[PDB]
C-alpha cells in the first residue's frame, strides 16, 4: 500500500509539473487524501484556487510596495 | 457559476471581517470600558488606602 | 489523520509561503469558499474526466501533457488506492495549465485591495 | 382618483369587476352560512384543500341574474360556453352553499341558455320575419317585467330575495320554457337544408 | 440555479451569524456598565474609608 | 372552503427537519431554519407543470437508468392516479417525484461530514 | 452571470456602506445630558 | 501604479475627480477581484475573427474594415503584450448602432440620492 | 517605439469611433496598458460595463443638477 | 406648456406599488422597498430590441399557446401600433408586453402561501 501511494504521488507530481500546476508534494498529498476521504472536488478546487490567489495577491503587493 | 460562487463566498468572508472591524471601531466603548475598570481599580485602591 | 480544515490551512500556508497571520483574510476566504455551496463540478465521472482532460490537452496541441495525463490516469486506475477517482481527475483537469501560454503576470493593480 | 375611489366604495363595490370586492358581512350563523360551511369543511377532512371562492353579494347576484334574464351577454359569474350559460366555478355567496348556489344558478343558466338561443334569431324570410317579430314582442313583454323588478331593486327600500324574484318570474319562466320547447320543435328541429317553403 | 439559491441562503445565514457575533463582541457595553458600577462602589468605599 | 386542519407550515418544516436529520425538532433547529430559508428562497419555475409530461419524464429517466420495468410501473401508476383523481396537484406531485427519482446504479454522493466544520 | 456578479458585488458594497452609516447614525446625547445636568446642578447650587 | 491608473481612467470617463469616483473605483476593484472562469478565447486571431464577425453582423462593413486595420496596426506596433486579451475586450465592448439603446430609465436616478 | 505607440493609439481611436465604443484616446491608452500587463479580458469587460454604468449615472446626475 | 405633472419615476413606482397592493403607499413600504431594490438593479438588455422582431416573437408565442387567432390579432395590432407612431420606444414596450403575456392554458402553479413569509 505504501509503495502504491508513493507511485501515485509521483505520478500526480509529474502530471502537475507537466501541467505547471505549482503544487508541492505536501499540498498534493493533502489534496489526494482529502479526495480519497470523500471531500467534494469542487470545494477542494476552490480552496486550492483561493490559496493560489492569496499567494499571487501577496506577490503583487510585495512587487507594488518594492 | 462555480467561480462566481467561490468569489462571492470569499467576498462574504472579507466583508464579514471588515464589518466586524468597522463595528469595533464605531461601537467602541471598549476603551471606555477599560477606563471605567481603571477608575474602579483606582477607587478601590483609595478605599484600601483609607 | 489531520482534519481536512487543518490540512487545507497548512496547504494554503505552504503554497503561499506566508505565516497564518499574513493569510488571515485569505484563510477566511478559503473557509467561506469551502463552506459555501458550490455548483456541481463540470465532470464527476473518473473516466469522463480523464477523457475530457486528454481531449483538452490534444486540442491545445499539448501532446506531451496529454501523454502525461493519460499515463497518470492509467497509473491511478491500476493502483486502486483512491476511492473517489472522479474527484481527483476533475481536480486535475480543472487545475491544468497550458505550459505554452506565458503566465499572465498579475497586474500590480491587485495590490490596491491588499492594503 | 381619491374622490372617485370614495364614490366607487359608496356607489357599489367593483365586485362586478374581476377585482375582488371584500365586503363586511355578519358573522352570525344564519348570516355566515358560507363561512360556517367553510369552517365545518375545514374541520372535517384533513385531505381537504380549500378552493378559492369569490364572495358575491346577494343584491349583486340578483342584479346579474336579472341582466342574464334580460338577455345580457358576457356576465362575469355566468359564462356562455357553446351557447350554454355556465357559472364561474370560484363564486360563492355568504348565505348559500356552493352546491346549492350552483344548482339554482344551473337552473337559471339553463333558462338563460334557452333565451340566448332564442335571442340569436335573424329573420331572413317573411315567415321567419313574422316569427322574429313575435319573438321580439315576447322578449319586450318579458323585459318589461325584468325592468320593473330592476326598478324595485333600485329603490332598495324593501328586502328582495332571489327566491322572491324566482317566484315572481315563475309564470313568466314557465311561459319561457313552453316557448323554448315550441320554438325548438318549430325551428330548431327543422333541418338547415330544408327549403324556405319547407321550413 | 437550485445550487445558487441554496448557496445564497447559506451565505445570508453565515453573514447574519457573523454580524451577530461581531455585534456581541463589539457592542456589548455590559463590561463597561459593570466597570462603572464597580467604580461607583469603589468610590463609595473610598469616601466611607476617608 | 374545505381547509383541512393543516398544521402550520412551521410545524411541518420542523417535523421534516427532525425526520431528515434523525434528531429531535429542537436538535434540528439549524436544519429547520435552513428548510425555512430554502422554502422562502425564490425558485425558478418547475421544469414541468403538466401531470402527464412529468409522468412521461419520470418514465424516460427510469428508462435512461435502464429501469424499463420501473418506467412502465411509473407510467401505470400515473395513469391509475390520473383516473383516481385523488391528488389535487398532480402536476406538482408528479414533477416532485420525477425530480426525486434516483438511479440505484449511481452511488449516492454521501454528503461529506466536512459540511459540519463550517457550522462552528 | 459575470454581469450579475459584478452588479451584485457593487450592490453589496453599497448596502454594506449604507448599513454602516445607519448603524453610526442610530448607535453626543450622553455629553449633552451630562452638560445639562451639570448646568442644572450649578444653577441649583448658585441659587441656593 | 496600475491602481492609480485605473482610478484616473474612471475619473476621466466619469468626468469627476478621483475622490468623486470612489464608489465606481470600488465597483471596478470588486469586479476585477472576482474569480472569473477562463476566457473562451485566449488566441489573438480568434478574438479578432469574433470581433470581425460581430462588426459584420451589425452591417458595419466599413467599421469592420477599420477595426481590422487598427488591429493590424496594433500588432505591427508591438506595444501591447496581450493582444488576445485586448482584442477580446474590444469585441466585448462593441455596441450595435441598429439595436436601439435600452435607455436607462430615469428611475435609476431616483435611487442615486 | 514612440511612433509605433502613437500609430497604435490612433488606430485604436479610429476603430472605437467607427464602432461607436465611446472611448477617448486617454481611456484607450489606459486600457492598452492594462491589457499589456495581463488583465483577464472577461474581468476587464465586466469592470468596463460597471464603470460605464457609473459614468452614465454620474452624467445623468450632472445634467439634472445643471 | 405645463406637461401634466407626470410624477418622477420614484413617485410613479410608489403609486404603482400602492395600486397593485390595493393599499396606500405608506402601507406598501416593504413592497416599495422591494420595488426600489429591483429598479436600482442592473437589468440585462431586453431579448429583442427590434419592433418587428419583438412583434413576431409575440405572435409566435401566441401561436405556441394555440392562440392562432390571438397570434394574428397580435400581428395586426403590432402593425397598427407601428403605423400609429405614438410610442417612442417600441422595442422596450414590445419586450415588456411579451414579458407580461400569460398562457391561459397552463394551469396556474398556485403559489404556496409560504411565499408571503418573505414579503415582510
Curated annotation (Swiss-Prot), chains A, I:
Keywords: Acetylation, Cytoplasm, Cytoskeleton. GO terms for cellular component: centrosome; cytosol; gamma-tubulin ring complex; interphase microtubule organizing center; spindle. It comes from Homo sapiens (Human). It is found in: Cytoplasm, Cytoskeleton, Microtubule organizing center, Centrosome; Cytoplasm, Cytoskeleton, Spindle. Associates with the gamma-tubulin ring complex (gTuRC) consisting of TUBGCP2, TUBGCP3, TUBGCP4, TUBGCP5 and TUBGCP6 and gamma-tubulin TUBG1 or TUBG2; within the complex, interacts with TUBGCP3 and TUBGCP6 to form a luminal bridge with actin that stabilizes the initial structure during complex assembly. Interacts with TUBG1. This is Mitotic-spindle organizing protein 1. Belongs to the MOZART1 family. GO terms for biological process: gamma-tubulin complex localization; microtubule nucleation by interphase microtubule organizing center; mitotic spindle assembly. The chain holds residues 17 to 82 of 82 of the full protein. Its main location: cytoplasm. Required for the recruitment and the assembly of the gamma-tubulin ring complex (gTuRC) at the centrosome. The gTuRC regulates the minus-end nucleation of alpha-beta tubulin heterodimers that grow into microtubule protafilaments, a critical step in centrosome duplication and spindle formation. Signal peptide: none annotated.
UniProtKB/Swiss-Prot annotation, chain D:
Widely expressed, with highest levels in heart and skeletal muscle and moderate levels in brain. It is found in: Cytoplasm, Cytoskeleton, Microtubule organizing center, Centrosome. It comes from the Eukaryota. Component of the gamma-tubulin ring complex (gTuRC) which mediates microtubule nucleation. The gTuRC regulates the minus-end nucleation of alpha-beta tubulin heterodimers that grow into microtubule protafilaments, a critical step in centrosome duplication and spindle formation. Component of the gamma-tubulin ring complex (gTuRC) consisting of TUBGCP2, TUBGCP3, TUBGCP4, TUBGCP5 and TUBGCP6 and gamma-tubulin TUBG1 or TUBG2. TUBGCP2, TUBGCP3, TUBGCP4, TUBGCP5 and TUBGCP6 assemble in a 5:5:2:1:1 stoichiometry; each is associated with a gamma-tubulin, thereby arranging 14 gamma-tubulins in a helical manner. Gamma-tubulin at the first position is blocked by TUBGCP3 at the last position, allowing 13 protafilaments to grow into a microtubule. Belongs to the TUBGCP family. This is Gamma-tubulin complex component 5. It comes from Homo sapiens. The gene is TUBGCP5. The chain holds residues 210 to 432 of 1024 of the full protein.
Swiss-Prot record, chain G:
This is Protein NEDD1. It is found in: Cytoplasm, Cytoskeleton, Microtubule organizing center, Centrosome. Interacts with FAM29A. Interacts with HSPA1A and HSPA1B. Interacts with gamma-tubulin in a HSPA1A/B-dependent manner. It comes from Homo sapiens. The gene is NEDD1. Required for mitosis progression. Promotes the nucleation of microtubules from the spindle. The modification Phosphoserine is found at residue 27. Phosphorylated NEDD1 can interact with gamma-tubulin for targeting the gamma-tubulin ring complex (gTuRC) to the centrosome, an important step for spindle formation. The chain holds residues 611 to 660 of 660 of the full protein.
Curated annotation (Swiss-Prot), chain H:
It is found in: Cytoplasm, Cytoskeleton, Microtubule organizing center, Centrosome. Ubiquitously expressed. The modification Phosphoserine is found at residue 106. Belongs to the TUBGCP family. Component of the gamma-tubulin ring complex (gTuRC) consisting of TUBGCP2, TUBGCP3, TUBGCP4, TUBGCP5 and TUBGCP6 and gamma-tubulin TUBG1 or TUBG2. TUBGCP2, TUBGCP3, TUBGCP4, TUBGCP5 and TUBGCP6 assemble in a 5:5:2:1:1 stoichiometry; each is associated with a gamma-tubulin, thereby arranging 14 gamma-tubulins in a helical manner. Gamma-tubulin at the first position is blocked by TUBGCP3 at the last position, allowing 13 protafilaments to grow into a microtubule. Component of the gamma-tubulin ring complex (gTuRC) which mediates microtubule nucleation. The gTuRC regulates the minus-end nucleation of alpha-beta tubulin heterodimers that grow into microtubule protafilaments, a critical step in centrosome duplication and spindle formation. This is Gamma-tubulin complex component 3. It comes from Homo sapiens. The chain holds residues 8 to 120 of 907 of the full protein.
